[PDB]
Amino acid sequence: DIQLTQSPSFLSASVGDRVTITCSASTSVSYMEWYQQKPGKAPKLLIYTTSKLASGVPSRFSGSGSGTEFTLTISSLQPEDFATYYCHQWRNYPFTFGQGTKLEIKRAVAAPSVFIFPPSDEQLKSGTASVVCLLNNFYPREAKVQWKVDNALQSGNSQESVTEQDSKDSTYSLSSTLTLSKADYEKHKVYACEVTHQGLSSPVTKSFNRGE
Amino acid sequence: ALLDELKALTAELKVYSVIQSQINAALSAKQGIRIDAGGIDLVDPTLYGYAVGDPRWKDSPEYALLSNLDTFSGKLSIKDFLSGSPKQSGELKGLSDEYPFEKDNNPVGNFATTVSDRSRPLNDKVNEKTTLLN
Amino acid sequence: VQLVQSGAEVKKPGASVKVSCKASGYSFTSYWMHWVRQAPGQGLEWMGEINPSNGRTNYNEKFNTRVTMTRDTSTSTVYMELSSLRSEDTAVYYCVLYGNYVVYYTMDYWGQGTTVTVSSASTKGPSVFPLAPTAALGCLVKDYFPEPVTVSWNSGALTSGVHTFPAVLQSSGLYSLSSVVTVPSSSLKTYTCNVDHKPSNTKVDKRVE
């Protein structure tokens, strides 16, 4: 197999920037192909035979390289180019893809606004309690959430996910859910999520007491 | 310089002869010929004198030529070769995916002369480079 | 050129799935057809190829004992069957026309994709719970299978400041998703989340307070 390793894996830039993404093959290959991919859509061919533009692709995109080193260059990024880019070779079985390069928009730091939500009474009726913590509109993307129940760190009972970068303000948002059984929930008083992020001089805690 | 050119040129001509062979066999049986996915695969060691599994195959100039064509994807149709680059004889463009037998002005026959006309200069060079070493 | 794939499927582990890809707009038997898949949050993987003129195939060694590609030339359709399914086979599957075709025509073509979900879970509609305390509010769309679920707010009229998060897969085998909206506190006006989980015919409107 020919492994394709892209660098960087993640890249931030601004509209108007010129960017270059590199694809390095573990052995020489005759040509490279390049795809763009947006959420919930099939990959879109941009460049084929190393340097040719696919029908209708803007002249902003170009490709080059040879041997083990191939490049995709976008000169003057437009808002629509922020996406994931993959290199791909169809010359050697099995055909292989790069791991992908995700391109995000640069932005000023923004601290998350944090909210906590107690389980609804309707859910408690069912034998399970979910406590939710929302980290809203932050930048950059990296953020840490810790759940504390009566000031004890929780393990193995929470899951989180993060939104795609917002189309208008370029921020991210995160939602974390703590799930306990009802009986377990009713054995503790203080429910808290503790947030750490670059935009915050110190961690923010949002909490509530089950009785109130 | 000269000696290496003769090797690559001769390998390219060999692929042309394999193609001519297929066409001739079609003309002999009064059959059309497919040069797309339904025709032969030119990436086949046995077409060039190699046993299947012979590791020498991947080091051959035949393989070097075929495997570096823009139209190569682990496999190569006759059309992929004729229209592919890079090769010394350039690219034949606008070919049909198949050529049917007809009694009048046979397409297979016209295809045959199209291919032989394209390989003729290549053959001349090979003869002439061979001719200045004996 | 169009490549039209069959609709989303759900399968238990050990079972098999058969996805179809109906081709038009080009000489069907003249080019190899490929299959490529993509698991959630992951990259792309080539599965194998089939020559529609003769039924010949070449598979990625990773799938070689589990995958079967066939075609019907009369209907210009290719099938991909994947057997002994495991949860790692949960992915979007694409039929693709590329390779040498792109040299000739300067573009490739992909089908719209088919989502296949493999799980010991069974189809189930979510419970929709309110998320209640600039303020934030939302809906917890919990314990459904399979994906997807759609959430709107106020029948689609409220889009600004809405965030609908990617679902997470719980240890139960069921998915859970939150959708929130932030508003000025003084608004606390009417807020309703509309949830639709097509696979289970669960369509729900939850007023959040």
Author numbering:
A (entry chain B): 1 to 212
B (entry chain C): 130 to 263
C (entry chain A): 2 to 134, 143 to 197, 200 to 220
Sentences from the paper on this structure:
The type III secretion system (T3SS) is a protein translocation mechanism used by different kinds of pathogenic bacteria to inhibit and/or control host cellular functions to avoid attack from the host’s defense systems and facilitate bacterial dissemination in the host. Although the precise mechanism for the T3SS activation is largely unknown, PcrV, the needle-tip protein located on top of the needle, is known to be essential for the activation and regulated delivery of those effectors.
The interactions between residues in CDR3 of h1F3 and PcrV are listed in Table S1. The presented structural analysis of the complex between the h1F3 Fab and PcrV (130–263) complex reveals that COT-143 binds to a top part of PcrV, which is thought to be an interface for the interaction between PcrV and translocon components. This supports the above-mentioned model where COT-143 interferes with the interaction between PcrV and translocon components to inhibit chaperon function of PcrV required for the insertion of the translocon. Our results suggest that COT-143 binding alters the interaction between PcrV and the two translocon components to abolish the chaperon-like function of PcrV, which resulted in loss of translocon formation. When mapped onto the modeled PcrV structure, the epitopes of Mab166 and KB001 are located in close proximity to the pore formed by the PcrV multimer, while the epitope of COT-143 is located in a similar region but more distal to the pore (data not shown).
